[model samples]
Target chain A: AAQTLDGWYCLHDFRTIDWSAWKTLPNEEREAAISEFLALVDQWETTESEKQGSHAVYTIVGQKADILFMILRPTLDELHEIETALNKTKLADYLLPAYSYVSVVELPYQIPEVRRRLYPILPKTNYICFYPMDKRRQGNDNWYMLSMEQRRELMRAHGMTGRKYAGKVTQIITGSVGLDDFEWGVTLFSDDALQFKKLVYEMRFDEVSARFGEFGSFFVGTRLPMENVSSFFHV
Target chain B: AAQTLDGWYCLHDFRTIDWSAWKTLPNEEREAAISEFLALVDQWETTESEKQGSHAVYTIVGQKADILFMILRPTLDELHEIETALNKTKLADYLLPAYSYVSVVELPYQIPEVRRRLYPILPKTNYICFYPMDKRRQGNDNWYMLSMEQRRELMRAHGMTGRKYAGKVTQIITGSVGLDDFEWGVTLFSDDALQFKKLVYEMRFDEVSARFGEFGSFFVGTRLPMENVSSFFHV
Candidate 1:
């Protein structure tokens, strides 16, 4: 009832590799695992090309994870299949799970203008940053009790702060649809990592974020080119 | 800081059995899985007896879960061991995790009277209901910026409503302790299911709850005795 068009179901699965084990594994054995992993990545790519799904992979910046996979599908079952497919991979045995998140995209749909954003292809920019968040629901600033109209006014001003960075940044705001009481996750893509810090720091200065933004852990990473999978794996 | 005692780390794990696969499996294999699971339960009990931990098991009433396990351990690692132990068991193949909650008990201390409540022996009542919560921190209702004294009065009044129940119901409130931006998971036990309905509805009407309480999913169930394991599993 929030008057927004719901798009694809989203899944963000982050993982850390058991580098110690990989470092000890025989070259031939490692190649086999890498090949199997490469095959699975191909299937994922095929789905994207067929317009059944969209995804992006990046080498995580810090120690929390080795890679971040942000995938989107028209259905939850497709997301499940992707997870199961990864689970059955030879490389799965050595990759440790860091965290995962599930969200769906919703937009204030207009016509052909806003249509592409509903099911847009994920950008393969050089850098990626992802985080999930919720708005305030307590005391005087309670985003909950305030009618959507007042909240909408605040969000409209909030959106402008980020929109100012248009060409330098691309954002995919996907989350649960429970208005006044719910969850959301935002992913930002850019060729230059500096844009991420600039946009987020600027957003925090806004009243919307200063009073209501409840952000969780953030993940920042560089894109991992698929052809270099074996090279990236090599010690 | 809020004046309360931090007790043992708590984990509320809820699971659902894959009844179709479990029912179709050979009786011999099913029996073996049950035996392994029973042994793990024994280990868990042994820890409780030694005063190193505490726990309870109940049959959840709704479709969200089959069994609810509320486990308390002296340390996070101990909780991890229990989870891993179960993961390696034969029965792990059948039990699907419906949901789980992590929290810690914090009480206003008073010698031996409140000490036991910290690392409590969960009550063995006939029925159980568990829900996680957060106090509001927004708008004029911001439970965050208010003086501890003002909020203290709110809790005093809020608690009075609950104290009226006395022996009719017992509650174990456990959760994260980064106050203001904190979390809590409360479990209520009573021989009469009606008590849960009464306590919760009344608590909601209280100003503390009416204006500030934020609740997640609720899981209610009957006690599932150890002896009933096999008969219940026999579809």
Candidate 2:
């Protein structure tokens, strides 16, 4: 097995705002909730500027969820604190969580200029998709049972498939073996949501996915701009 | 592949209460929220009594989530209505969704008494563990590619592993091929939470899981009785 180089802990939190309840709230209360939420967002921006952490917000499609936030920090405590603080906000009362994933930034097989893989920058694209996955460990198809050379050769082929969408889709893979249920969490960003479906579908035929891969639920959504945050909450 | 006998559409809605905000609410408002929520639960109970549907509530362990509500209905429309109604309720304001799975109760391989598989009554065990999964479809390991005889042999072996747990664990399998992301959803109920880890871990060593099975995130929690519904929301 190739050695892993791990960096910041990551949390992908998804929420669906309660529009009906927000509309029922008095106008003043609604405004207060929006303001408080924006203020928290501002604080996070400052933290990002200082290079202590990074975060992004997106609007999810379908009834699955409304907003998706990806936050990366040096400690798990900060992740917990972020959730606790959000839960305490007035706006949080109007927002319901839809899903959450815990993992860490990682590179299972190191490449030259690997430092970039450790502390990565999240893409700000028009759309984002996230899902968790595992490598099969079955009797005959076990990924871990293969020699390092065999694994590397297969990964090279896998990399070739991903490169096909290099400019169109930005894929960030995180490790979650011991931290969460799945072995890895994948986040993809692109200008067109259809690119995600096309890329993932094509990859499914590759040996990496066809034989060795096991995936979790897939979440697809669009980016939510900071300036439009309040409008999204407005009834 | 054997034909699956599908039953009620199922929705597993998970949520976490904002204890800090819930505690801050005035006694009157708290009472109102509780009463409204209970009224909805009462409606579900009535429907279950008529055998039109079924539902249950559980308190989850760990920080992943706090509550899990499993609702089974005859149609997808009814499942959607349940979510919409809960969102509109006064109590949903403070309850944040944690996770959700969309599926339908199913039995892929027929057994002697197939009637029980078509219409399942969820167990009221002290604990519940839920997750979604898929079978591998790699070059040689594809589950869909396997002949009926081969698949049956593997499944029979798988059944033996499950039978070892017998009365200790009650498992309900739901198929989500077209409804959601994963191919199947597994809900296991038991009085002892440790049994979940034991069963799942043991199954991992079996041929079915070692090579063919691909799993999603796992959620474990405890039962929440209707009588203690108020106390659960009480700050």
Candidate 3:
């Protein structure tokens, strides 16, 4: 039986600020809101520094969303608390919701030294592309029914494509089976956003993505620095 | 060639309120916000009554979100304007975005010209479950590569399963090929939420879903009455 090496609970909370309303706020209120949001960001940094959790924020490219906050913690309750706390912040009042995804970090296949699977350090890339996906389970295309060796062979082939973009792209796969939607959430990070398209589009020709893989909506965004976050909210 | 009969542009905007912050607001301010929102709801109802557009509101079950506002409009620009206008409202200040999907009402295959595929009247069911999906296009499992007759045959079998839940569930299919991430968005409305799981689960065994269907995240929620909209926001 295939068992997952589960790790941290993950939340990808995407938001779009009401630029129209945000611009209407008095400077004092806007400043207050910015300061409070900065404080929250500092706290998240502290948590990351302590290695208790990790997080990153990005400004999305299109109208699909404006911001992306990806947080990972040891427990689901903690994740919920974090989200709730953020919601209570002054700046959150101006930030409209866009999209959110819940899942957990887990290795699909069991590996040696399982202890290393629990904690993951998210990369601080310039751009991030996130989406959820599933493996096919049809009559002849079933991934679950395949022999372990056969599955491994296909995965190895898939990994080859990743190797081609090894330095250009970094992938953090989170398993969401029984947690939220889709089976796995694939988050890719790179200094160049176009690399995301290239890598994903290239992988489409691979058997895993081409034949058995099923994908969800793709969210692409760039990092929002702490200092720049204020300007980001400014009209 | 596969073509779609396009109708109204649709927006499924999901949001969660900052209850903690909402509780802190003065009663007058809260009341003002509620009334402002109610007025907006009244406007949507007027549009619906005019046969120009339609909408529905639902309270989501899980922490994934709190409220779902689904609106249908005559054009993509109108949908964008509605979202922007809502974002400017006072009530929007307390609402945090969770998820949003953009698409247009569409029919997968051709239907009788006498029967319109566009301008659908949305049903107000007790529960709504929405997700986006795509058809596989790899190897022998590629849905796009299949002949129109073969695809139609598979879809016909898929429709049979839906027939079983005729009265119990109502489905709305929207095409988002170039509009959003996925090619199609599936919205299911039912008084019994379990039917969503049952119907989707059963359809997974069908050839269309089993071999070609690729799904996205699933959002399940219950309806929120227009009369109770104010109470829903009360701290």
Candidate 4:
């Protein structure tokens, strides 16, 4: 059986708004678009009532993204549903697909004990750092060739290092190999953002991270709680 | 008005050819596509007659791009004309805009006076590493709030450290704030790729980079010289 861990199934869905075309719409049409978009947001908000999902949206600080929606769900199919619902929204007409990534929260097998304990206790972190990663495949550094046993051993070592960071950092690992450009998506949550650097820097010495991993761009941001939505999106 | 610097205007044009649609084209139509594309390429080549431009075409190694063409022109209008012309091409129907960046070959203001001796020698290297960068803007780490003098001093210090690499690395720092996602694009041309890492790593320690500077993804590749065009494109 394929081992499946129970955790957050996160979706980092990115979109580029076609502003010129969007602005050309009639004022009433624009207002309708906003209302329809908010209705979908309302449905997402209600998902939290069932304890089935949660979401956060942010206006990306740079041109890399015009906007980003980070949704957390209990099942992979829930993410698909969210995508379908969003696509049906009136505001969808103003957007172009920029980028999207799918990943499930992964608990590395290396430190089973740490994973066990950490899963029971979610940290109180205000900020989150996320980025996707792949293992190097250049020249001689290839991660896929190793046997499952060998891979398990490396993850075991990698997991132990995270155990040392128990209270300081709570990391959510998501496997994204076939779904996204990156093999994995790592999201680190911490009250003090510096702990992210501390844990990542420490993980470098571990075999799985140091020798085998290649990383993509890093996105560091603060959480925009639901209640603050109006204020955050005022622009 | 924004200050400007003279440069060989660089356009990193990208397009993703639609394999399925392309394969479906009839022989005659396909021939027309090839002939039209060649005619456009020929016009671009003729521009060199004015001694006003140069270009490089490379098949990017991975999915990042299907066709990568770097065009240099003396005027921005010529560059835009190329983009508009390509957009109207019959093949454009099958081409997706993967990613594109507009930049100019630039030299940072603070490169050390001693290393200035490098101007005496012509570039003989055959590799270039180009990447965009932004300054961190999260709370205390904001780069824009710093005074001009402070920025200049730190940049000067950064340059002094770069001078240690001397002939080993030649870096062209292109500013692209309003033009692209990142504030600046760092393009390094070097014979030894390892030196690219060394030079970047060394500069990382300088306070400017260590504290204020943020970076984008790094792309390292061998210069796709005009010769060997067939071999480079061969699947």
Candidate 5:
């Protein structure tokens, strides 16, 4: 009864595009909205050549985005059919879908028999860091009324300080209580990134990331290679 | 100042992992997740071999992943030492953490003190758009209770509708309030990704993104070339 974590299976797809009237259209109506965005990027590259799924089409550099399509699926309805096929394409009608977040991929446990050996598998790190968390239950700090052996001895003293970054880092933990919105989802893979801030600042001095941690929003990327998928969206 | 953007240089690193309990060893005890993930990808490939940096490692496809790493640097402390070397690794002890953001690389202002000519150089676009923003303060929308001459006349009418997507988009606006938790950090670089939905759908009807915008999360990536870096990490 330690806890569980493996890896892979993640998603962070956000959006925000509607540049006034998509900048007064007219370049043949933006190439028919770039040919229906290349027919939904060729149906997500034929579901990543039938490997079931994989995706990364970024360009979110400001104003919260004019585009950001980050998707990877092995389930969750193939990340909800690529978010309802980019909300029914056709340049999602001039775009203006601001934000969206659904999480999965966490690794942390010290008891409850590590969530039955973390379901299946996921881990081959070159890099991975997904986000979603919550523990602070508010007012006077709650954490869902402890007890499960006080959250398994505060996660066995937070797994003995993550057993001192043993051999560097590689983790996977997922639990979303009811899927989505901070409750769980922490995926991390390493090949150095300052051991992700020294293993989250030494697990923020233990005690569950310093008295029931609670965080949301953090998406660090890089790791889209399968023959560089036509350079992550080129024209 | 007519705009023209060409890319390279953008890092969005967010992490969260601690899968219950490293799924209780045995996979040959994950050789500590491939020896601290190949020593943090050989310390980010020796900072992209001299010329400084470039990175991408995505596995973020659904549920806001548990790992989605994307790094492209030329500075910003080598993206703060790959987030301080993945927080002192050792598989970040069964990770279960989330959220991290910091921004750079913007271009939406146009002359008149355009950060005094982008504080000295670096401009070209092959495409870039990184997101994280928030302005609406819910109930009675707020953008820091206006008045800085009405937030610079609503950012000078949202900088003249992003100067008519000046030569097809090239915006940069960083200021992620205390580094994250969204306050404004929009970066957009283009070579016609439909001018990022026509300059963010024409700045969503001005008024600073339509009545003080409030957004967080949106990342569209591509533009990492420091000599293919192992075809963006093989797997």
Candidate 6:
């Protein structure tokens, strides 16, 4: 909570597809765009396989976006290159960028446990729930003004609350600090999306969240596999 | 919290499609199935339009089920007919029942507000999150053992937490004391599925939920519009 170790660079890119325009395309052109999309997907997969980093692709549920591409890299340069290349694709013409976030994984505890979590191979969970957040700073709730001991005790309780959901919900905490508007980005993955509600609910009761937590709009979606891309876009 | 005025008979029908078997069917048979499914959807729509009840159809993510059909009627007879009619159709052949819940809408506050919520028109939100829950009845945490006044104060606080999220999340509570295994079923509808998480998280911090609320498995999904059925089932 005070000073945490920073790990991989993280980027969350969300985009909405112009469905009306996409459907209006000639069948051949749509197929061509799809082929190019598939190529990018393959490249991402190859990079993931190399253990240089990891990524997740999901179909956003509402008007917030049509798709979400979340990637982690050892350096910000890799993330920038990946994102820049995506925007240059012919497929990008149909995509309207909705939102994005920049951050670095945050954590540290037991040495081995800390190392494992910092470089996790993102799970292929059926669903993903993400949002940004910040600790209080105004009035009597100032988080940074508190002593490190006080903050550590608060976080200890918060951590215990989350531990109860260890198996059902996989959580990743990324600190933005100077990198983005929010102080942190929380991403939770699970096969059972309902657990997202329960885990979040239970954790909010902890003193840390109850007194200091402020959250941003949430984004939720189902995992979209590479094979499903064609079907997802088929008119 | 006690002696809530109950309204409407509710039935949640969840089903998983036998995709392998479905995709293997002849085009002619598939069309026949689609037609039957369309007819049922039309009937459900007509019922909703008549103001007799409202229904929702969403595609459940993950392995829980492929689809969810949630119906509300003034009486159990109507709820049963709809459920029975679904299982009797040719379209039902490929649908393996996954889960179902029986309950009645629960509420009461100001006269108009209670009336509005109790007989609500299920929203056409982009996503739905549902789950069953029960107040504690075991050991020192027994909720039922508390005095009515004590429980009332607890619930008042819980209700306040929920009100803060009014514009973002729509919640429906159903009591199932003698009807099902759980005591209550909470269904939340929202355009931003993330609101379900934030709302539930914040509410759990209330003394009532923090000390006594026990929740069951959560189910979540994206709304599947009537017009999208053909596309959803298309091979």
TM-score of each model's B chain?
Answer: 0.94, 0.93, 0.93, 0.72, 0.34, 0.95
Give one digit per residue, the lDDT tens place, for model 1 in B39-121. Answer: 88888889889988888888664235667888899897888788778878878777788888878877745577687988888
Higher-scoring candidate on TM-score, 1 or 4 = 1
Docking quality category of candidate 2 according to DockQ thresholds: incorrect
The DockQ assigned to candidate 3 is 0.09
Q: Is the docking of candidate 5 incorrect, acceptable, medium or high quality?
A: incorrect
Expressed as tens digits, the lDDT of each residue in B64-95 for candidate 4 is 66665566665444554566455546655555
Runs off by more than 4 Å, candidate 6 = A108-112, B1-235
lDDT score for candidate 1 against the true structure: 0.75
lDDT of 1 by residue, A1-235 (tens): 2255667767777878989987887889889989998888888899889877898988897888888878887764466457645654667666766766655665646476566677768998999898887776555665655666887888987899889887998999886421111367789999999999999999998889988888878899998889878888997
The per-model lDDT (C-alpha) reads 0.75, 0.79, 0.79, 0.61, 0.54, 0.79
DockQ of each: 0.07, 0.09, 0.09, 0.03, 0.04, 0.05
Candidate 1 predicts chain B with a TM-score of: 0.94
**Which residue segments of model 4 deviate by more than 4 Å?**
A1-8, A19-32, A108-126, A137-139, A147-150, A164-168, A191-198, A231-235, B1-235
Which model, 1 or 3, shows the larger TM-score? 1
Q: Backbone collision count in every prediction?
A: 19, 3, 2, 3, 139, 1
Give the top-scoring candidate (TM-score).
1
Candidate 5 at residue A91, lDDT? 60
Docking class of 6: incorrect
Off by over 4 Å in 3: A108-117, B1-63, B67-235
lDDT by residue (B17-118, candidate 2, tens digit) is 777578688989999999999999999989888878888898664347767899998898999999999989988887788888999988733464565565
Least accurate 10 contiguous residues by lDDT in model 2 chain A: A108-117
- Number of the predicted model whose DockQ against the real structure is largest: 3
